[PDB]
Structure formats: C-alpha cells, structure tokens
Design an enzyme around this catalytic site. Sequence first.
Site, mmCIF file in Angstrom:
data_model
loop_
_atom_site.group_PDB
_atom_site.id
_atom_site.type_symbol
_atom_site.label_atom_id
_atom_site.label_comp_id
_atom_site.label_asym_id
_atom_site.label_seq_id
_atom_site.Cartn_x
_atom_site.Cartn_y
_atom_site.Cartn_z
ATOM 1 N N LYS C 12 0.813 -1.207 0.000
ATOM 2 C CA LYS C 12 0.000 0.000 0.000
ATOM 3 C C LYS C 12 0.852 1.265 0.000
ATOM 4 O O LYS C 12 2.040 1.199 0.253
ATOM 5 C CB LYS C 12 -0.960 -0.049 1.174
ATOM 6 C CG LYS C 12 -1.960 -1.161 0.985
ATOM 7 C CD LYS C 12 -2.911 -1.291 2.164
ATOM 8 C CE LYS C 12 -3.931 -2.415 1.944
ATOM 9 N NZ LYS C 12 -4.787 -2.653 3.161
ATOM 10 N N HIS C 118 -1.429 -5.704 1.276
ATOM 11 C CA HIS C 118 -2.662 -6.424 0.911
ATOM 12 C C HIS C 118 -2.327 -7.778 0.278
ATOM 13 O O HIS C 118 -1.346 -7.890 -0.465
ATOM 14 C CB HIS C 118 -3.476 -5.643 -0.106
ATOM 15 C CG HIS C 118 -4.468 -6.489 -0.840
ATOM 16 N ND1 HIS C 118 -5.707 -6.802 -0.322
ATOM 17 C CD2 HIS C 118 -4.362 -7.181 -2.000
ATOM 18 C CE1 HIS C 118 -6.322 -7.650 -1.127
ATOM 19 N NE2 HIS C 118 -5.524 -7.897 -2.151
ATOM 20 N N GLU C 129 -8.487 -10.709 -8.663
ATOM 21 C CA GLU C 129 -7.568 -9.589 -8.471
ATOM 22 C C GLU C 129 -6.411 -9.544 -9.468
ATOM 23 O O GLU C 129 -6.067 -8.478 -9.974
ATOM 24 C CB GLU C 129 -7.055 -9.596 -7.030
ATOM 25 C CG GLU C 129 -8.176 -9.437 -6.007
ATOM 26 C CD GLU C 129 -7.703 -9.464 -4.554
ATOM 27 O OE1 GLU C 129 -8.578 -9.401 -3.665
ATOM 28 O OE2 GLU C 129 -6.476 -9.552 -4.296
#
Lengths: 143, 142, 142, 143, 142, 143
Positions: C12, C118, C129
């Site tokens: 992130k 993540h 994803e």
Amino acid sequence: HMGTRERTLVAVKPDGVQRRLVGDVIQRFERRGFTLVGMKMLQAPESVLAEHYQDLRRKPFYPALIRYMSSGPVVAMVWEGYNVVRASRAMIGHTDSAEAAPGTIRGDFSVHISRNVIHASDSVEGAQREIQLWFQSSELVSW
Amino acid sequence: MGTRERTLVAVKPDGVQRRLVGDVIQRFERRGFTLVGMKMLQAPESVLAEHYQDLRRKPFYPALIRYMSSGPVVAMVWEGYNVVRASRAMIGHTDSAEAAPGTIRGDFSVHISRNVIHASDSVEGAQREIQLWFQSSELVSW
Amino acid sequence: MGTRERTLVAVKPDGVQRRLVGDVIQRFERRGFTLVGMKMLQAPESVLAEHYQDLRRKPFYPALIRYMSSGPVVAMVWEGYNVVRASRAMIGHTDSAEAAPGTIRGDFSVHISRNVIHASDSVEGAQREIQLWFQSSELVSW
Amino acid sequence: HMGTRERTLVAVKPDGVQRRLVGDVIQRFERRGFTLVGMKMLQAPESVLAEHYQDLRRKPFYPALIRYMSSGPVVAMVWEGYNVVRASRAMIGHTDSAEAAPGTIRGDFSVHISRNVIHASDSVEGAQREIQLWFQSSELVSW
Amino acid sequence: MGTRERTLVAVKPDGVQRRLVGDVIQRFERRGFTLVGMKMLQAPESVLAEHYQDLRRKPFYPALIRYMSSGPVVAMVWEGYNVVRASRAMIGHTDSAEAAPGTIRGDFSVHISRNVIHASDSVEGAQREIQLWFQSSELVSW
Amino acid sequence: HMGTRERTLVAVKPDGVQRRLVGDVIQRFERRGFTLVGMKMLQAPESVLAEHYQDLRRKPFYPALIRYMSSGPVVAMVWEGYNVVRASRAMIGHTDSAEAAPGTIRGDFSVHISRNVIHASDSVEGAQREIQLWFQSSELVSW
C-alpha cells in the site's frame, strides 16, 4: 585510559534519528565487540555545539551547521575497546557520504555532507576532549 | 492523545551485557514508533524499589533487586498510537522459554529471571514509570 | 495446479513511502515463492472501485479510496504451493496493533487504516484480483 | 532533472531474480534514502537489449550476452535522489564480481562476470538514455 | 542438569541445498544456546532407519528415507536451559504452510514433506538421537 | 578441481565460536553462492595446528598462537565454487582487524590480530594442503 580501555565519542546526528537509524548504528558497534559505556538522547545546546565544532568557526557554513545540529534530537554515546578510536573512524566513512565506501555507515545510509548521519572522534586526544564536553563523569558506567 | 501515547521500555542488565541494545531499538524503530527519551544508567536502589513496589511482598524480591542493579540498564521512552499494548505484545511472555518466536523474549531469551527487557503494562503504569526514570527536560518531542 | 497456485500481493502507499518494499519482497523470497509479475503504479480509481467493490456499502469507503490513491502502490504476483493461505498468515491481522510479531503487520505497522500491505483472501479472489491489475503479457513464468 | 531530482536506471539481471536477491537489492537502495520512481518485471525484448548494449555490438561475446539477458525475467527500476548516479555506481562494485569489494552488491552476492546480478547507469547522460529506453513516461510516478 | 540440557537439531537436505544453514544457526546463537557439536554428512540408511524407527509402520516411509538421503544434512548439538522445548517452539508446526511466521518453518518453508529442519521432541528422545549421530569424542563442552 | 570445482578451507577461530558468530560467517559464504562441501566442529590437536601453522614456527609468538588456537572449539569448513579461494580471501580482510575494511568479516566483527575470528586458505595450493590436513576424503560430500 589506554590500549584496551581506550574510549571515543560517537553521535547520531538529527538526520540519523529522524530517519530511524539509531538501532542500525548501535548494532554495528555492538557486533564489533565494543562496550557501551555512556549514552543519552538530547537537544544539544548551541553552547556545547560551538565548542564541539569550535575549530570551524571561521568557515562560512559554521552558522548554518550550528542551526542544523540543534534542529532536532541527537543521540550521544561513549564506546570503549581496543583501537576503538581508529576503528570507529574507519566504520563511518568519508565526510562526503556520496563518496564513502559501501560497508561504511555513511556509505550505506547517506548521500549528503552535513546530513551524514553520524560523528566520531578523530583522535584519542579529541575523544577525551569531546567526551568531557558531552558527558559528566557520573553518566559514564564502567563494567 | 491517541498518537501521543507513551510507554517506558528498558533493556535489563543482561540485554546490555549480551549486546542486544541495537537489536531491541531496531524493532521499535521499524514498527514506526518515535523515540522521545533515552539514557544509559546504573539504576539507584530507591528507583528500583519504587519501580518494583508491587513485588515487594512476593517471593524473590531481593534476587530481583540484585539482578536489576548488577549492571547498567538502558531506559527509553517511545511514543505512538497504541504503543503501550503493542510494546507489550512485542516483548512476549514473562517466561522467555514459552514466549513465541518473533517476540523479543522468544528470540533472545531462555529464562524467566533474566528476560532481557521491560515494558510498561498499562497507560497509567507508563505515566508513573516515565516520571520515575526521567525528568521532563530529558524528553524531546519531535 | 497445486504448485501453480497464485496470489496477488500489493504494498500500500504507506509501505512504499516508508520504504518497506525490499523488506516485504524479501520475506516472500526466503519463504521460497516465485515472483511471476510486478509493477509500480498510481492506481486508477476504476481499478480500486472494482478491487474494493465489496466495501462499497460499508463505513469509510471514501476514506479508503483516498488512502489507496494518495501515492503509488507496488502490485506483485507470487506463485507457489499453498501461496494464498501462507501469504495470508504472513501479513497478519487487519488490525496491525493486534497482529502477532513476526507477521508483516505485526512488525511494521501500528494502525488498522494504514496497514502496509494487501494479499488475496482466497483462490477465487486471487484469480479475480490478478486479472484486474495485470494483463497476461505481464506475467512471466520461470 | 538535476541535483536532488537526478535519476538512474537499475536492473536486476536474470541471475539475480532466479537466485531470489530482488528484495536484498531493493533494501540497499531504500536504506540509502533513494526514492523508487518506477518499477516492473519483464522479459526484455532482444530489440531493447540490443540498444541497451549497443556499444558492445562488436565484441565477440555480444551475441552470447544478448541471449543470456533474455533468458529470463529482469526487474527494471528507476531511482531518484541527490548523487544517485554516482552513488549507485559505487554500490554495485567492479564488473568482475570476484574482484568487487565486500560491501558492494556484486562483492557480497556474486563471483561471475556476465552473471553479476545487477546493472546501473554509468553516467547521468546514459541514465537519461536508458530510462527512456526501458520506460514510457506514463510508468514513472513522481512524489 | 537444567542448564546442561541438550538436544539434536538437523538441517534437512532441502535446508542445505537452499542455503539456509547460516540462517538456522544464527537463530539458535542469538537465543543464547551453546553449540557443543556439529558436522555435515551424507546420512547412512542404517542411521535414518534407527532415527525414524517409529515411522516404519506409517504411510510414506520409503518416500521419507529417500528424501533424507537425497543430499547432505548438517547435524548439531545445542546445549542450554530448557533447550529441548525452546528448539521445538522455534521450528514450528510440522505442516510448514500452517507454521506461524517467526518460526523457522513459518519463515522458510511451505511443505509438510520438505520442512527444512528437525529437532528432538523430548529429553529422552534427544539423549537417544545424540548418541545415534555423534560419538562422545565429537562433543566439546565450552 | 579447477575453475568451477575450486575448493578452499575456511575456519572459524575460537574467538568466533565463543562470541557466537558462526551463523553470521556462514550466511556470508552462502549468500555469495558457494557450496558447502564439508564441515565439522572440533578441538584441533596441537599436531594438526603445528602443521597448519608450520611456516611461522620460527616466530616468537608461534608458541602462544598454538596454545590459543587449541584453547577452544574451532569450526572447519570446505567451500566450493568458481574463484572461491581469491573471493574468500577478499571477504575476510586484513590480518589486523582494526585495519580491515568495513564490509569484510574482520572489518565488521573484530579489532584484534590473533583473535581475528576467521582463517581462509591463501592460495589454491595451500587450500589443497590444508583441506587434506583437516579433513579425511570420506567427510567431503560432492553435490
């Protein structure tokens, strides 16, 4: 205060403290076998900094240097051991970090000149002078 | 005030003699906490007695004072969000032998007695301990 | 097919600004996983919205999109036996403050909001994803 | 694109990726304070490799080098910071890893010549050329 | 006698081929244990059969002997207070995939089969295993 | 026994074992890609030490050196790989640790001369001689 009881002053500069390299710096002195004999974090008073850097007073950057060095906390330390003065000097590397060799502290962590992370006494005599300047005898603990 | 939370962490005499100070400080640094105070000192017995007043009526109190004054300790004040409970989880179980690997005691210690490090057990305990070991003029907020 | 299992891992914006990319990648590398895809990019909001569609009807969704687009992220695709569940165990609890030391969140983070990294929560989630962040021509199998 | 906004291209070679040294290499650039501005893993097209290594085309190993460099994935990166070009050059060490100094990246991880783990632009000018070659402007993110 | 407790630790063939010997030894060293014996050797099948006699009547015994003799192993004898149980907690779950991060299996392995390392499961087991792999003249007490 | 199958003897001295640097030393040889081909911990017999250090027998410290080297356990190892002899020699650093460069093993861990943590064959020929001296052929395992 000779041979094996030789001592030196090492200081982590404001940039080193803010970039959170304090642990990193101490590990290198510990793994080399030195003995930590004194240590404290403080905002150095300009009066102490002026005496510390007294022989650069003439230089034009002296005023900027003093402001920078008091712009944040510093961690002062006293290390003891055989050849500790020359060994610490070799571990830190060239004043200009960008030119310092990989493996030295400035060589692995910095690329600047005034923000070069750390200070170490350049001679046995200078170390005796600097240690008395930053520390009171009662703050040093001999093992 | 949340992210102004503070706690006392101290490396015990065994941690210092075994040269684990950099290792310990490094774990707090990479977690993102801010070091607002620190010093190495031979702890006076009056400070230890006040620090450990709750153990004064439990077994082995004299052995406890003896150990904690057998050499210098490094006292530190760290600041950050939820720093009291996080520092608690990081040092691990009192009984080093059953401390989980990954915690400071689980990685560096094997005894219950000599367990390398100390951290305040609560916010009010932290306020008390910090005032005990440091003067306000020794704390620097950055 | 077992050892062909794949998962998406992303550092992130806070992990990147705090310079923890090498630290993160190193943990996956020593565990023995194979890096089959990677890139640094400022995430488009259309991608984030699709990535976080399940949180669209929960509190603080706007704060979530704001954080995830406040700077670049590093997206990676790791391959290996049981990589989805292992990557899950390695990053630790959502609430960094209660994440166990040894996990990535337990070692590097203190917040629930800004929690550094993540990882896909399941095999089907991973397939989704990966297709979302990468084109097939960006994945290299070695 | 000068002084503090200076940029350089760094690449982890196929040997470096397969031996799983990617994290190790990145940590060294991060701990020195540089800013990661672009990054991607790819199988470099021989056309890109030919231009990258264009001034070695005459050498007899040029053909072998091109095959080797496209034999596996490469990780390309762009780093930004003060003196980043010369600092990165000093961190990698001598072309011949066996002769590279301990502390440099080749000095700690390799003992070969073509399999020397990493590449770094040798000059500001060369870095501008290499970055344009490996990256499109849209893949670079300025903080 | 308490702090004279001993245990056998062995890096399996996969741990050696993956070059994790220094990593493994380092974890025991910083915990404070004393290395009193060590050697690299291609294990003879008679030793493996005696070492694994309890698994002789369980599934996949032949696959087990095959793996353990597919390359050299490094056998070590560590000494220290509560070393048997501490070494057990440090290596983590048999099923590497579910081993907690921070333990050796949780950090370096992903399989149940190839799980990098071995440690005696008890004091009596340790006495047996040590006598099995080492001669008394190979143990040095310092 | 040439090129890629070149071998060398490396030994962690008593000081290195007692200060618990065994893992640290092995990690550096492993990360550089060498292959561990033989290894054992032992209290070296003075007869082996005398032959090992045979060409210093005349020196006045020779007797003190032999006593010191047998004063505690030593860890002996044989490493294999391309240029392993010269590479290992560069990794250890100057005999005098206080003068050894940061990044080398003596440069990061020691400050003494006889207690300089580690030994490594100084030449291919010497390595063949030392390996035969410390190891029986049956203790070496080729992958």
